[PDB]
Design an enzyme around this catalytic site. Structure first.
Site, short mmCIF file in Angstrom:
data_model
loop_
_atom_site.label_atom_id
_atom_site.label_comp_id
_atom_site.label_asym_id
_atom_site.label_seq_id
_atom_site.Cartn_x
_atom_site.Cartn_y
_atom_site.Cartn_z
N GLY D 10 0.80 -1.21 0.00
CA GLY D 10 0.00 0.00 0.00
C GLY D 10 0.84 1.26 0.00
N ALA D 12 1.15 3.70 2.35
CA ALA D 12 1.93 3.95 3.57
C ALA D 12 3.15 3.04 3.63
CB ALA D 12 1.05 3.77 4.81
N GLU D 71 -2.10 0.36 -7.17
CA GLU D 71 -2.06 1.53 -8.02
C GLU D 71 -0.60 1.92 -8.20
OE1 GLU D 71 -2.36 4.77 -5.71
OE2 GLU D 71 -2.58 6.32 -7.26
N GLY D 143 -5.83 1.79 4.92
CA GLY D 143 -5.89 1.64 3.48
C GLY D 143 -6.56 0.34 3.07
N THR D 145 -5.67 -1.48 0.47
CA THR D 145 -4.59 -2.43 0.17
C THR D 145 -3.82 -2.79 1.43
OG1 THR D 145 -4.42 -1.45 -2.03
CG2 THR D 145 -2.60 -2.85 -1.29
N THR D 179 -8.22 11.41 5.14
CA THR D 179 -9.49 11.85 4.58
C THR D 179 -10.52 10.74 4.54
OG1 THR D 179 -8.33 11.65 2.46
CG2 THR D 179 -8.80 13.87 3.26
N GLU D 254 14.07 -13.71 18.00
CA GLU D 254 14.38 -13.09 19.29
C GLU D 254 13.41 -11.96 19.61
OE1 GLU D 254 18.53 -12.76 19.51
OE2 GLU D 254 18.61 -12.30 21.67
#
Ligand SMILES: Nc1nc2c(ncn2[C@@H]2O[C@H](COP(=O)(O)OP(=O)(O)OP(=O)(O)O)[C@@H](O)[C@H]2O)c(=O)[nH]1
Ligand SMILES: Nc1ncnc2c1ncn2[C@@H]1O[C@H](COP(=O)(O)OP(=O)(O)CP(=O)(O)O)[C@@H](O)[C@H]1O
Ligand SMILES: Nc1nc2c(ncn2[C@@H]2O[C@H](COP(=O)(O)OP(=O)(O)O)[C@@H](O)[C@H]2O)c(=O)[nH]1
Ligand SMILES: CC(=O)Nc1ccccc1O
Ligand SMILES: CC(=O)Nc1ccccc1O
Ligand SMILES: [Ca+2]
Ligand SMILES: [Ca+2]
Ligand SMILES: [Ca+2]
Ligand SMILES: [Mg+2]
Ligand SMILES: [Mg+2]
Ligand SMILES: [Mg+2]
EC number: 3.6.5.-
Lengths: 425, 54, 347, 438
Positions: D10, D12, D71, D143, D145, D179, D254
């Protein structure tokens, strides 16, 4: 490459559509002949959303012009930017629709809809990835209303998974061409309830009151009204036509603005609306307070009579983005009784650095308010006033329609009103 | 306040300090999920087209 | 325009504060479930502190300190005093107390019996009180009374030498209202109340609890001399200070108030690192009701701390307005001679 | 040497991943063209940095990374960015239209048609590894995705790589920089289906990063660039042990052993300090005690909450820069006597400490000031349940009216998945309450 196909149908639809392409062509730096003459790469960043690129660096709008009589589209071709449209994309008949929804939808319109779909199919086939469609039209006439909703119905049959948006002018007795407009509008509204994802409700009465009371236009014309619609259409599509952290395509917009499938009718708004004290710089507080003022809204509905499901504001121009949040966060936290409390954070804001032509900065309002029920209430009352006496129905029964289809259209819109009423409490 | 397991290298070191002692879905199953949702989308689209054909 | 929500309809105090806020014309009350608020008058129990301070652009303030229950819980206060070095186990102003869990459920059963037997063998007064009420001088009765219940109890030494007011030869307690703002300033309301017993104190009969329990509800329900010496068994500081001058040739400030102010500071400074909202995403203030006992040596003892206190009918207006001035308007200003006494301290 | 493959899902994840690999190159001396002068083994070697970078015969150091997005606009930035030469086209996967912030669209409709391609590309990186440890998965909660495709990818990875560790870096939704309105739905849907497939998840609340950028960096309105530059510093602090010589958190396993005693409670709280504005005339450099004390201030946590009212199950201190164990223990003692640090009775009251002598690297022209020492504290607190409580409450408000549900049903999801996912979150909240409260 997320292309949109634009359709404008009928007199109102083509006149508002013409001004729309005139306004955004200017913002993207496209001259009347399709040649780019801008000074910023932001103008071309998302140019392919609404424009195709032809030979010679020419940009041609992805627009389909439809009507059942030639007149209006001859004016477009002779208009300011008339030569910018693809010659093949003019689809018109000769009979006309006579302000008759049944002629646009069932008789005259049926004879012409297949050739329109041939053009739509062509524009779609040359799209890298079609976002969806947008239709401009009126609901009070015959072609935009009757044939407009027929086109939508057939577009949805061929493109079931594409977004369908419309800018729909709602009729008003104060700005009326014929008495059958409530009939045509009630018949179309049901089509829109079923087959559109987002409908921007533009009320001719609100546009008139704004011209007379706010803009101080003594004798407003259709041209004056269409100046407000152009500006509004340019504002609601800013996020699609320019870059920014917002991003967002038609579907992502619908997903966040429409909580229920049938309640997708929006109140648009614009600020400033200044009379000719027109050079005065408008501060961010003024932009925000005006944008949320009812007088600045074009659905002719008092939002204080209902509740906002979702709100979206778009600010254009070089302004303080910190002060934009302060004023927006101020209008909410100062009138929170008109926002539903079961959709968290339902007021969203976006900023675009490019202002409209001749404006330091502007704000466009997009509200999904249950107050919109007042618009459908008005239409229903005018419909019922005539239908209870079957007045003027012969125009429609003469086109093969039965009275039962009117009764259903009436029951459907009263249902729509009732659906808004339960979410308002 | 004890330090245990002190390790030192050229780029740093690490240790532990104790202050107080104490007191899946198969590939097939995922395919069915995906195809089931696909079938429900097909059914809803068929009902749309059936509506539009009427 | 400031917005606030009311989530405790039963608070006689903040019902007035809410009544005043609206009187200013600059505060708007929202639905109890509207998250876009500046001030929350929250519920007593299970207040969702985790949902505060996350609304963009809103500075949010609540009328409770998350974690103050350690001070306003019978068992909690006992554990806090014993286990806190700032207060130590030798705390000279808190009666000897022990936390005792009923046998049908750490626990201090053996520790209590150790101190009890010591007193019994040394001819010393060995009367204790159990509460979460039974007063007795036998350890067998006190423990059997807790087992019959199902919640945690506390056994503490019963002040067998209370200061008795004259005439009447009667017991009493002292209520002090304390306000702690968002900056953790400790304000003591200058007006206190004595909830006096309208019955003569009797040390040879702990079966009738009407002369040993100074509660305003027990006196107005089980006492036969209610309202004889003072209206509603409530003596205010002016009269009490005058009595101390006439009978003891001393003052309320010198003889008692210094000890009260010391006890309030000690309790609140002790838990400041645990409840302070200084660097927190939201802010807190709270009103407290401290209950004190006074023995015949004019030594002040702490009985308990109430986190959701009421006020004396005659003092609601003054105290409630004072809450709006230092607690609410200090964070949300509007478009004296303070009624409080600031107890300075190091943060 | 055991390899780690990073997956960015995505917008982010991709933009965060881009910022991280820029930082990794600056940290390891890797130029934008992939060259690494200090690497004296041309096209080979099993050094610590080789866990994140392979080597071509030409001497290029290629990230072990996969970028996935439905996208192309965000990933196109990587293809033409400063470090375009690092990656080859196989590593960058882009569709043509995104999930429209719709979990069901990213998981079912689109996910079904792209999952096999992404696996094939990850298989290509896996085949280059002599001993793959597992995966680091970067994505947003809100998102379509980042929530919808990620969970599908995690399900499949658990099938194709059973004995491999999977860690997450998840962006928790914050209205101030979003948004969208449906993010609470996507957040809960993706956590429900991902919970049993993630071994350790580091949540970063955008609200927390936003306020740190305003409070410490004096950014009146921070952008995703400011947010990502700061987030990649924390990520670098967390993954540094895998990329540098050391003995603490030397492999992905770990992370679970030191931070997650109970499997479902695998969301450590991250705290970072100091964050100093580079525009400052010149800041006084903080001491070990001061920065270690800062790790117990709510204002520099990746998720705003109050650890004074939770309970600790584990606690790692990761120091970078001029730090010697002597000062760490002296600062710890000083903090136990002044702070409210309540461990659970079935866990030792201790701290694992790691020191890397190389101080934090800062991107030239960035917002962050160069400091001589910094620390990131990973603590598994019940206090982070506040974040689930907030998120679940927003979910409940909308779902009571079925608002927006039709978009998810429309893509083939059953309405029952909402309630199923919601009941799993209620159980998760109950787990935190059984361990933390008395
Ligand atoms: N910290 C940070 N958050 C981001 C960034 N980009 C997006 N977000 C957050 O992610 C959420 C939106 O989801 P996205 O990642 O943008 O959407 P997506 O994963 O690409 O899925 P789609 O819906 O198909 O676009 C919002 O809460 C954003 O605030 C970023 O670069 N940094
Ligand atoms: N150790 C002790 N010695 C003497 N008297 C005591 C005592 N403990 C309690 N009391 C009496 O009990 C009364 C207070 O009881 P307590 O405060 O424990 O119950 P409570 O908390 O329900 C009343 P409130 O919270 O309203 O002050 C006081 O009037 C006091 O006289
Ligand atoms: N705003 C606006 N409204 C118009 C315009 N032209 C017509 N209308 C309105 O549209 C309705 C008539 O529909 P019209 O478009 O003329 O019919 P059609 O050509 O058959 O589609 C009436 O309500 C008119 O007031 C215009 O240019 N602008
Ligand atoms: C509404 C309508 O049909 N109007 C009309 C009137 C005269 C001739 C043709 C017409 O269409
Ligand atoms: C431009 C538009 O129509 N939608 C929009 C605007 C601002 C924020 C969020 C949004 O969805
Ligand atoms: Ca014909
Ligand atoms: Ca090498
Ligand atoms: Ca697993
Ligand atoms: Mg006309
Ligand atoms: Mg009490
Ligand atoms: Mg995306």
């Amino acid at each position: 490459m997320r292309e949109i196909v634009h359709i404008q149908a009928g007199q109102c639809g083509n006149q508002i559509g013409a001004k729309f392409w005139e306004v955004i062509s200017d913002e993207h730096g496209i001259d009347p002949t399709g040649s780019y003459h801008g000074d910023s790469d932001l103008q071309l960043e998302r140019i392919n959303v609404y424009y195709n690129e032809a030979t010679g660096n020419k940009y041609v709008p992805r627009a389909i012009l439809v009507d059942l009589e030639p007149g209006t589209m001859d004016s477009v071709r002779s208009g300011p930017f008339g030569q910018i449209f693809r010659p093949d994309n003019f689809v018109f008949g000769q009979s006309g629709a006579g302000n008759n929804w049944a002629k646009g939808h069932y008789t005259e319109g049926a004879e012409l809809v297949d050739s329109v779909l041939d053009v739509v199919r062509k524009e779609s086939e040359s799209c890298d990835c079609l976002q969806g469609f947008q239709l401009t039209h009126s609901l009070g006439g015959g072609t935009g209303s009757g044939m407009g909703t027929l086109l939508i119905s057939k577009i949805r049959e061929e493109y079931p998974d594409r977004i369908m948006n419309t800018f729909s002018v709602m009729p008003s007795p104060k700005v009326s061409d014929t008495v059958v407009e409530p009939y045509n509008a009630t018949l179309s509204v049901h089509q829109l309830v079923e087959n559109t994802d987002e409908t921007y409700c533009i009320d001719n009465e609100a546009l008139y009151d704004i011209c007379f009371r706010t803009l101080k236009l003594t004798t407003p014309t259709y041209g004056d009204l269409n100046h407000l619609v152009s500006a509004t259409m340019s504002g609601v599509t800013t996020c699609l036509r320019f870059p920014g952290q917002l991003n967002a395509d038609l579907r992502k917009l619908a997903v966040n603005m429409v909580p229920f499938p049938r309640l997708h009718f929006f109140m648009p708004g614009f600020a400033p609306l200044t009379s000719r004290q027109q050079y005065r710089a408008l501060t961010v507080p003024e932009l925000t307070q005006q944008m949320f003022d009812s007088k600045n809204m074009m659905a002719a509905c008092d939002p204080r009579h209902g509740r906002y499901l979702t709100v979206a504001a778009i600010f254009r121009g070089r302004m303080s983005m910190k002060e934009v949040d302060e004023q927006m966060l101020n209008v909410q936290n100062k009138n929170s009784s008109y926002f539903v409390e079961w959709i968290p954070n339902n007021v969203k804001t976006a900023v675009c650095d490019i202002p409209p032509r001749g404006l330091k900065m502007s704000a466009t309002f997009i509200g999904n308010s249950t107050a919109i029920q007042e618009l459908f209430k008005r239409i229903s009352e005018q419909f019922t006033a005539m239908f209870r006496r079957k007045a003027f129905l012969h125009w429609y029964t003469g086109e093969g329609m039965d009275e039962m289809e009117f009764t259903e259209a009436e029951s459907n819109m009263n249902d729509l009103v009732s659906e808004y009423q339960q979410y308002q409490d | 306040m004890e330090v245990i397991e002190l390790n030192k290298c050229t780029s740093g070191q690490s240790f532990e300090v104790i202050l107080k002692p104490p007191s899946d879905p198969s590939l097939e199953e995922i395919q069915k999920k995906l195809e089931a949702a696909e079938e429900r989308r097909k059914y809803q689209e068929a009902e749309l087209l059936k509506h539009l054909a009427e | 325009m400031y917005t606030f929500v009311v989530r405790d309809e039963n608070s006689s105090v903040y019902a007035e504060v809410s009544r005043l806020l609206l009187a200013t014309g600059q505060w708007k009350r929202l639905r109890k479930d509207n998250p876009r608020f500046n001030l929350m008058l929250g519920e007593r129990n299970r207040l969702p502190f985790g949902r505060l301070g996350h609304e963009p652009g809103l500075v949010q303030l609540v009328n409770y300190y998350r974690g103050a229950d350690k001070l306003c819980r019978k068992a909690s206060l006992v554990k806090l005093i014993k286990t806190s070095p700032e207060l130590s186990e030798s705390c000279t102003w808190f009666p000897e107390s022990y936390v005792i869990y009923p046998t049908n459920l750490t626990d201090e059963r053996e520790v209590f019996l150790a101190a009890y037997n010591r007193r019994r063998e040394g001819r010393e007064g060995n009367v204790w009180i159990a509460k979460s009420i039974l007063i007795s001088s036998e350890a067998s009765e006190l423990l059997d009374f807790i087992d019959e219940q199902g919640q945690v109890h506390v056994i503490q030494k019963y002040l067998e030498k209370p200061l008795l007011l004259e005439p009447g030869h009667r017991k009493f307690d002292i209520r002090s209202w304390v306000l702690v703002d968002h900056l953790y300033n400790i304000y003591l309301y200058r007006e206190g109340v004595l909830r006096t017993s309208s019955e003569p104190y009797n040390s040879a009969n702990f079966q009738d609890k009407t002369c040993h329990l100074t509660n305003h509800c027990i006196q107005k329900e089980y006492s036969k001399n209610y309202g004889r010496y003072e209206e509603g068994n409530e003596m205010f500081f002016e009269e009490f200070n005058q009595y101390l001058m006439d009978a003891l040739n001393t003052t309320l400030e010198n003889s008692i108030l210094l000890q009260i102010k010391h006890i309030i500071r000690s309790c609140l400074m002790c838990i400041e690192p645990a409840i302070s909202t200084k660097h927190l995403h939201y802010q807190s203030f709270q009103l407290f009701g401290f209950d004190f006992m006074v023995d015949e040596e004019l030594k002040v003892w702490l009985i308990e701390v109430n986190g959701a206190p009421a006020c004396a009918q005659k003092l609601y207006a003054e105290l409630c307005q004072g809450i709006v001035d230092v607690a609410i308007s200090s964070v949300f200003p509007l478009a004296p001679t303070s009624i409080f006494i600031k107890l300075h301290h190091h943060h | 040497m055991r390899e780690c493959i990073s997956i960015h899902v995505g917008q982010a994840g991709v933009q965060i991943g881009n910022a991280c690999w820029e930082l990794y190159c600056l940290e390891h001396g890797i130029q934008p063209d992939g060259q690494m002068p200090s690497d004296k083994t041309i096209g080979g070697g099993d050094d610590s940095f080789n866990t994140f970078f392979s080597e071509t015969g030409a001497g290029k150091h290629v990230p072990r990374a996969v970028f996935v997005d439905l996208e192309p606009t965000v990933i196109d930035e990587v293809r033409t960015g400063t470090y375009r030469q690092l990656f080859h086209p196989e590593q960058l996967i882009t569709g043509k239209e995104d999930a429209a912030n719709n979990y069901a669209r990213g998981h079912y409709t689109i996910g079904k048609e792209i999952i096999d391609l992404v696996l094939d590309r990850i298989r290509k990186l896996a085949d280059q590894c002599t001993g793959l440890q597992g995966f680091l998965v970067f994505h947003s909660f809100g998102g379509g995705t980042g929530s919808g495709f990620t969970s599908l990818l995690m399900e499949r990875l658990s099938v194709d790589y059973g004995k491999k560790s999977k860690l997450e870096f998840s962006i928790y939704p914050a209205p101030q920089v979003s948004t969208a309105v449906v993010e609470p739905y996507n957040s809960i849907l993706t956590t429900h289906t991902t919970l049993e497939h993630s071994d350790c998840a580091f949540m970063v609340d955008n609200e927390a990063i936003y306020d740190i950028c305003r409070r410490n960096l004096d950014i009146e309105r921070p952008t995703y660039t400011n947010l990502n530059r700061l987030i990649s510093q924390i990520v670098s602090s967390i993954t540094a042990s895998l990329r540098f010589d050391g003995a603490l958190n030397v492999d992905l396993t770990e992370f679970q052993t030191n931070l997650v005693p109970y499997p479902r409670i695998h969301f450590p709280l991250a705290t970072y300090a100091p964050v100093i504005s580079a525009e400052k005339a010149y800041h006084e450099q903080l001491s070990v005690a001061e920065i270690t004390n800062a790790c117990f201030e709510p204002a520099n946590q990746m998720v705003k909450c109050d650890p004074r009212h939770g309970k600790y199950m584990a606690c790692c201190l990761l120091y970078r820069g001029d730090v010697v164990p002597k000062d760490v223990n002296a600062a710890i003692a000083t903090i136990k006597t002044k702070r409210s640090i309540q461990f659970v009775d079935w866990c030792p009251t201790g701290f694992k400490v790691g020191i890397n002598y190389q101080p934090p690297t800062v991107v030239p022209g960035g917002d962050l000031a160069k400091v001589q020492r910094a620390v990131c504290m990973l603590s598994n607190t019940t206090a982070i349940a506040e974040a689930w409580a907030r998120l679940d409450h927003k979910f409940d408000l909308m779902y009571a009216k079925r608002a927006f549900v039709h978009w998810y049903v429309g893509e083939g999801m059953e309405e029952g998945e909402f309630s199923e996912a919601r009941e799993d979150m209620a159980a998760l909240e109950k787990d935190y309450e059984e361990v933390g409260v008395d």
